Amino acid sequence: GYNGFG
Amino acid sequence: GYNGFG
Amino acid sequence: GYNGFG
Amino acid sequence: GYNGFG
Amino acid sequence: GYNGFG
Amino acid sequence: GYNGFG
Amino acid sequence: GYNGFG
Amino acid sequence: GYNGFG
Amino acid sequence: GYNGFG
Amino acid sequence: GYNGFG
């Protein structure tokens, strides 16, 4: 998955 | 999935 | 500013 | 996965 | 500023 | 995986 | 500024 | 994996 | 500034 | 500045 921050 | 922040 | 990707 | 920060 | 990728 | 920081 | 990649 | 810091 | 890659 | 790679 992708998180811009976390 | 995708989260701009998290 | 903030961009989750850009 | 990808995290911009972590 | 902040970019998760760029 | 990838973390910009960790 | 901060870029997770660049 | 890859960590920009650790 | 900070870049996880560059 | 800081670059994880360059």
**Cα gap B6→C2, rounded to integer Å:** 13
**Cα gap I6→B4, rounded to integer Å:** 21
User: What is the CA angle A6-F3-D4, rounded to 5?
Assistant: 50
Q: What technique was this entry resolved by?
A: X-ray
Residue from C6, A1, J6 nearest F3 by CA: A1
Residue from G1, C4, J4, C2 nearest D2 by CA: C4
**Cα gap B5→J3, rounded to integer Å:** 22
**Cα gap I5→G3, rounded to integer Å:** 8
Interchain contact I/G (3 or more Cβ pairs less than 8 Å): yes
DSSP B4: S
H6 Cβ partners below 8 Å, 6+ apart? F6
Residues within 8 A of A (CB atoms), B 1-6 only: 1-6
Other Cβ atoms within 10 Å of J6 Cβ, number: 7
* Cβ–Cβ below 8 Å for E5 and C6: yes
Residue from A2, F4, E5, G5 nearest C3 by CA: E5
Indicate the resolution in Å: 1.1
